[PDB]
Design a protein around this ligand. Structure first.
Ligand SMILES: C[S@@+](CC[C@H](N)C(=O)[O-])C[C@H]1O[C@@H](n2cnc3c(N)ncnc32)[C@H](O)[C@@H]1O
Ligand SMILES: C[S@@+](CC[C@H](N)C(=O)[O-])C[C@H]1O[C@@H](n2cnc3c(N)ncnc32)[C@H](O)[C@@H]1O
Ligand SMILES: CN(C)c1nc(=O)n(CCO)c2cc(Cl)ccc12
Ligand SMILES: CN(C)c1nc(=O)n(CCO)c2cc(Cl)ccc12
Lengths: 380, 380
């Protein structure tokens, strides 16, 4: 019954993640002034460049140069020696208004509760009782390893660290009537950008002793655990200089690390009318409510929409065999307890609030008691 | 036992798909001259602009202006009245060499069979016996609806059609010991860019009669099927002008439409050393070989890698209860029959061949008998 499963995460300075954080900094800047801003902000990052491309219709007056540079400063790219500098990079803007054809079909002259979905699409939510936060252990550990690197970089413990990092955790699991039980950590990968002076042995020793041991419980690590620490051997060039980044290129790191499923839509840079984000948050909320409500040990929820139509076209449930109730019965409970129209989700989950930049690194789920993380008490 | 499931697809002129096709046109142009080119080409598309950003180290001499414009011409954006024109758009290039730190860790001075993975990551393959091509019916139908639109646009049957389109199909399924059996089509969405002159009723009638009925077997359609045809009411502005596109933003349309799982990696614009593509193709090959070999009715395969390491770190199998063999036994058969090192996959799947632009619309799987679609005869 044992099997392996692997998930990854990336740090705040990974170039794709930089783009997600900038897109969400732009969204938050608009929402701070105009709660009804229509935002679809894509970011591209390459050596010396941040480009904003997309569509925004808003009453806000946003200084894009300032917002982008402040987000890059927070990440830690503040000197040409690190490969990128917020003070001196190029910020290019190619932002236009939202298409009037989309606006008229989605939200113009519509009652807010009856606003149409901002696009068609499918979205999934997932939850698992294997951790208290209802997330897979593989991705929780991978995110915590990146957070630990950023913490040790920022506190000056490991001053050779730079912001760009990736981690990957393989866990050996057992299964119990469809539920999954972590046994041990089989393999860990960590790659992190570093300065020119530190040697490979110093980095590998620090990654094991100060990063892994500070994050992963000793009970999961044993003589057989495999460690791939700085496996490329050299990672001085990093950030956008090493690899072009784009918004919405870490959608599995943003969600469930290979567990569950994904409908394809990116989250960052989008206001609530874009169901790629709002309905995925609501689907997580449903899945977590079913698990915390004791109806399932783990569950996957699909929802789908048509552009301009408020009610979902379909809702579906997959409980992996972890409920005494059928998936048909769980779907009936979901339909009695939730209303997944985007104009209702916005109210339930407070989606006009400018908290989006906080979601754009370390996963959107299983952290900080955001509204989609607070289970709904179910009536049935 | 019945349930709904939804998948989507997009047309060749959808802005994200334009980027995937251009990225793969660039990759093919390099491979035509240098089979060992190292390519990581991202494309961004917005009103009047194609930007190439990324990393290429190659002996090829490629005229990016010509390659990009020819790809856009093929798609059909050839006049400002359509919102985009290959003859007059801006083509900007921000391409640098591959990082020497990545090159030394991955492939420099390595025997080809022993080349390291070009990055860490996880990848999935999936196959289902519900169609002869071993793909989910939801996504097969969604892709065929977009292909039908392009066919009727190109043959002048529906001259008001423009290249940008999206489709979405919800199927009602039954299940039989973990396998899935399509019963009927519950809902279809089609949105397609159109000229200023055609009216909504003419378009909705043509979409039902000339598109849906030409694609979806009548046995799946009934008096209850729901049709959302041009649900936004107006879609004159389209292509990059309506929505910024980026490479690798349709990863679920490229794969299994919500079925199975995804590791997050994009396919287009990447040579074989980027396991995001090559190992996902090999994982599809494994899954399809298990199903066509009669071992499973449907199966999901995970594989993962560390940058610079040739052998996968993990391989895992999930058969949804559709085999008499345990997942442990199927994993043993996979390990006896396949070698998922990238330097072996390249040989098995002929991944230096410049056929990638053909994969970049209508899904990478279940079409054209590409090498990953030809099952391997299994020995056990
Ligand atoms: C390996 S690069 C992707 C492939 C790359 N575009 C190429 O040209 O080969 C993907 C991510 O890995 C990390 N990375 C960059 N350089 C690296 C290095 N020298 N060693 C390890 N990881 C690296 C960064 O997080 C980067 O965004
Ligand atoms: C609806 S747009 C995404 C949201 C958009 N970025 C915004 O500013 O609201 C996503 C895709 O839907 C399609 N689309 C564009 N305009 C549309 C319209 N008027 N009606 C229906 N679909 C449309 C195109 O394929 C486009 O790439
Ligand atoms: C309980 N087991 C055996 C798994 N449970 C899942 O939920 N999935 C699906 C992950 O999306 C698996 C996917 C693979 Cl490749 C292997 C194992 C599993
Ligand atoms: C057989 N059934 C009931 C399903 N089979 C799957 O393979 N999955 C997982 C899709 O990734 C489902 C996912 C949902 Cl949300 C609903 C149903 C199913």
């Amino acid at each position: 019954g044992t099997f392996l499963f692997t998930s990854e995460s990336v740090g705040e300075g990974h170039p794709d993640k930089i783009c997600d954080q900038i897109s969400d900094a732009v969204l938050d800047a608009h929402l701070q002034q105009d709660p009804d801003a229509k935002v679809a902000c894509e970011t591209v990052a390459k050596t010396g460049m941040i480009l904003l491309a997309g569509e925004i219709t808003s009453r806000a007056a946003v200084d894009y140069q300032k917002v982008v540079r402040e987000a890059v400063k927070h990440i830690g790219y503040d000197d040409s020696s690190k490969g990128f500098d917020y003070k001196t990079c190029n910020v290019l803007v190619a932002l236009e208004q939202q298409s009037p054809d989309i606006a008229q079909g989605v939200h113009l002259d519509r009652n807010e509760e009856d606003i149409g979905a901002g696009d068609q699409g499918l979205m999934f939510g997932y939850a698992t009782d294997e951790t208290e936060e209802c997330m897979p252990l593989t991705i929780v550990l991978a995110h915590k390893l990146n957070a630990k690197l950023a913490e040790l970089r920022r506190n000056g413990t490991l001053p050779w660290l730079r912001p760009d990092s990736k981690t990957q955790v393989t866990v050996q699991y057992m299964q119990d009537r469809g539920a999954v039980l972590p046994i041990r950590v089989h393999t860990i990968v960590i790659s992190v950008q570093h300065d020119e002076e530190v040697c490979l042995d110093e980095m590998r020793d620090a990654l094991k002793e100060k990063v892994i041991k500070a994050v992963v419980p000793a009970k999961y690590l044993d003589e057989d655990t495999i460690y791939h620490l700085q496996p490329s051997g050299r990672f001085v060039i990093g950030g956008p200089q090493g690899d072009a980044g784009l918004t919405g290129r870490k959608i599995i790191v943003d969600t469930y690390g290979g567990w569950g499923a994904h409908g394809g839509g990116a989250f960052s840079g989008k206001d609530y009318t874009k169901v790629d984000r709002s309905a995925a948050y609501a689907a997580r909320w449903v899945a977590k409510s079913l698990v915390k409500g004791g109806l399932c040990r783990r569950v996957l929820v699909q929802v789908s929409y048509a552009i301009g139509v408020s009610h979902p076209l379909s809702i579906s449930i997959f409980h992996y065999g972890t409920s005494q109730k059928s998936e048909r019965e769980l779907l009936e409970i979901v339909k009695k307890n939730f209303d997944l129209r985007p104009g209702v989700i916005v109210r339930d989950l407070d989606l006009k609030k400018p908290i989006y930049q906080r979601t754009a690194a370390y996963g959107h789920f299983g952290r900080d008691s955001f509204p989609w993380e607070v289970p709904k008490k179910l009536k049935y």
